[PDB]
Design a binder for these strands. Structure first.
Ligand SMILES: [Mg+2]
Ligand SMILES: [Mg+2]
Ligand SMILES: [Mg+2]
Ligand SMILES: [Mg+2]
Ligand SMILES: [Mg+2]
Ligand SMILES: [Mg+2]
Ligand SMILES: [Mg+2]
Ligand SMILES: [Mg+2]
Ligand SMILES: [Mg+2]
Ligand SMILES: [Mg+2]
Ligand SMILES: [Mg+2]
Ligand SMILES: [Mg+2]
Ligand SMILES: [Zn+2]
Lengths: 114, 69, 91, 134
RNA sequence: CGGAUCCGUAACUUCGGGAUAAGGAUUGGCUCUAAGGGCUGGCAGCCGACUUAGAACUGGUGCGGACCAGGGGAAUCCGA
RNA sequence: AGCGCCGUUCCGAAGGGACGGGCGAUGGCCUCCGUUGCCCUCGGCCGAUCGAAAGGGAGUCGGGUUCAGAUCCCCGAAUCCGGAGUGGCGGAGAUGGGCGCCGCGAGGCGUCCAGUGCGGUAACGCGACCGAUCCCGGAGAAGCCGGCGGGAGCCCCGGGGAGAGUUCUCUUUUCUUUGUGAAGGGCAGGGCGCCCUGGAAUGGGUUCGCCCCGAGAGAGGGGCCCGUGCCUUGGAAAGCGUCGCACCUUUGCUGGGGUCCGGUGAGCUCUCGCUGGCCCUUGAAAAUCCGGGGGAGAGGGUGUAAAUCUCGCGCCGGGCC
């Protein structure tokens, strides 16, 4: 029933100004500008639609204020990759190195005869 | 501001260097000891008047305590 | 509940654009929107993203294929001839 | 029934992801508090750095200082390996019950550290001590 | 004429349309009836939204009572 | 011919800066560090520069004040970015184990060694968590339109209180009002394509609609993100209607009630999230910032304490329009 006005010189409902109306202790409604929501980082080559867990989802310039404990995970590739792809890469690396060892000993056993 | 719940840290903050202002607010079954510092305003609330009447004298003298109301 | 006699997906166009044009576009309107069986996952989730781009919903293994179908009858025989030439006389 | 306390076992998920663990005691049926089959293992935390001919003995003694750890793990979070490390681990210091006491855990970790370095200095089983690049 | 509810909708056609085709009946007011839900306990008790359908009574056949608002059909020529 | 023009990476010796090491000189309490000159190693600009007062872009809200100003002035409460050379104070890294001796014991002494943090099986958590060239990745950084759900404001009803209107008759009636900002903590609520036990078909649980399941469903137990909602510090002493004591260029101060109990909704607006549809339309870059991999190097070496701190505080400044 009470129509209020903007507080800044911006007069266009663009993306830079997102106002939510709030009630002051003085018994009146007024707009408050909200910072754009920050999205959590996504892994590299891991699960595509799933963002990373345990990492704070906030604007990039805010990460200067956050501590390292609230920006990464304790495991290897904490804030860069997801949990599935880490063990995937571990198993892949171990298995391909075992296959290299296998092909090396195969070349050796073929050389010992030919 | 910062709310203080324990009995040992509010006095340590009140005996600091930037504790220039200490105010006492009396309310209905509530007593608030607000100590103003350079960055924050530490508030300790208590519902017992007996624990307040004996604690008001425990403040360090010379800090310009202002009893509100 | 049969709602249309002969016209199918191209019933959204209505009475415009002629009859033979709708009959010709319906054949590929059936295919470009129908889900296909993923040759890697095994599920019927192969919705096309853009022209010639087909990505799955399970593993998201995107593949480049035909513009209106998952694979073209020309590329099939091209792959067959490529395999034949590879096996003949050791590539 | 091939997983024995002799072989080496990689760690897939966890804080020590891929840290060259060796099983101290495997429980395949499962305890009462843990219905899943598991295996108490001991692994290396920080691998020893590279040594050369130009780096002196005072530098080799610093590089050889390694950090170990002890931990129980589920079979789904670990992968066995055909390699094996033949080092005697007395079950008195390293036990499944030391996880309730920080001093006992420190004692077990300190025992595992020396047990690992005495096998590392002789040069046997260099694959267990070289870091897996993944 | 013009909204809404209930029946009925032709020639032609690319079978998608024509179509609100065309042509008909009702519409107020005040009392009612029936149906359409949720919550608590080992089938019962309370809580609140307005929608539909039917009937009775009644006003000098007046009821979209102001405002709001598709005339229609049969054909030719051209342009999809 | 020429004022000049085309051209913007092309036909260019188009990086003047830094990590470290060495030689040499200088200054501050020459103990120790800060600089200067030279040598070695390393280092793709995607080419200077301009281009948005609606694009990207860190960080202030509540009350009061004038004849003309308000996120600017005052009060009160916060926050962002930079500085620390004789490094401001605390907490981490920092303090343990083995042998022998003395002491009844608690403990003390001599040698050696460890100590660049911990916990949970996990998804992950905490008060901090050594890091040089380099490399990798994310955020910045995304189209339009249907649906559905959550939150808030406004609207509606019922009760209570203050004030106001009608009362020839009726009406516990009608009208105005009935509060918690940024910031920090906790708890509801929402989302998860996140983990563990176990594996189903007589198929299952599910949406308004689809969709999902052996590449692990139903069920049970946990974790993560937003928490614009609720309570608390701010916070009732300000603000606002009410009946008053001084006073008409000295006008402040009284005490009460306000932070009262609730409910409903295909209701309107804003926001958040899930999902679907549309294609010969795929719906912007850059600056700033973060995380990870690598391990060149640095650090006291032990019942004394350093390399470093993205932790809790404290000090100083933020120019111009
Ligand atoms: Mg702008
Ligand atoms: Mg006719
Ligand atoms: Mg007609
Ligand atoms: Mg009734
Ligand atoms: Mg025309
Ligand atoms: Mg510019
Ligand atoms: Mg103000
Ligand atoms: Mg003005
Ligand atoms: Mg600072
Ligand atoms: Mg909504
Ligand atoms: Mg808040
Ligand atoms: Mg609502
Ligand atoms: Zn696939």
């Amino acid at each position: 029933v009470q129509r209020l006005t903007y507080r800044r010189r911006l007069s266009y409902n663009t993306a830079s100004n997102k106002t939510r109306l709030s009630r002051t202790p003085g018994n009146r409604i007024v707009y408050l500008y909200t910072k754009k929501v920050g999205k959590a980082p996504k892994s590299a080559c891991g699960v595509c639609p799933g963002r990373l867990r345990g990492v704070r989802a906030v604007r990039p310039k805010v990460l200067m204020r956050l501590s390292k404990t609230q920006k990464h995970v304790s495991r290897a590739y904490g804030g860069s990759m997801c949990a599935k792809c880490v063990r995937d890469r571990i198993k892949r690396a171990f298995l391909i190195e075992e296959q290299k060892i296998v092909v090396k000993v195969l070349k050796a056993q073929a050389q010992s005869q030919k | 501001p910062r709310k203080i719940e324990e009995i040992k840290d509010f006095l340590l903050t009140a005996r600091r260097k930037d504790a220039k202002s200490v105010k006492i607010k009396k309310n209905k079954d509530n007593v608030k000891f607000k100590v103003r510092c350079s960055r924050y305003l530490y508030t300790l609330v208590i519902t017992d008047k007996e624990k307040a009447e004996k604690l008001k004298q425990s403040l360090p003298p010379g800090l310009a305590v202002k009893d509100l109301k | 509940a049969k709602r249309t006699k002969k016209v199918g997906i191209v019933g959204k166009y209505g009475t415009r654009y002629g009859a033979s044009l709708r009959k010709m576009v319906k054949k590929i309107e059936i295919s470009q929107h129908a889900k296909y069986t993923c040759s890697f996952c095994g599920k019927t989730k192969m919705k096309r993203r853009a022209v010639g781009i087909w990505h799955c919903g399970s593993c998201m293994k995107t593949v480049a294929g035909g513009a209106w179908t998952y694979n073209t009858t020309s590329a099939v025989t091209v792959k067959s001839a490529i395999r034949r030439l590879k096996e003949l006389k050791d590539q | 029934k091939f997983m024995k306390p002799g072989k080496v076992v990689l760690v897939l998920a966890g804080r020590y992801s891929g840290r060259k663990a060796v099983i101290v005691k495997n429980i395949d049926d499962g305890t009462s508090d843990r219905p899943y089959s598991h295996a108490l293992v001991a692994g290396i935390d920080r691998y020893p750095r590279k040594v050369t001919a130009a780096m002196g003995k005072k530098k080799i003694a610093k590089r050889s200082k390694i950090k170990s750890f002890v931990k129980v793990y589920n079979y789904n979070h670990l992968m066995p390996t055909r390699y094996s490390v033949d080092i005697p681990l007395d079950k008195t210091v390293v036990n499944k019950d030391v996880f309730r006491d920080p001093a006992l855990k420190r004692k077990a970790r300190r025992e595992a550290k020396v047990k690992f370095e005495e096998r590392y200095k002789t040069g046997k089983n260099k694959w267990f001590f070289q870091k897996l690049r993944f």
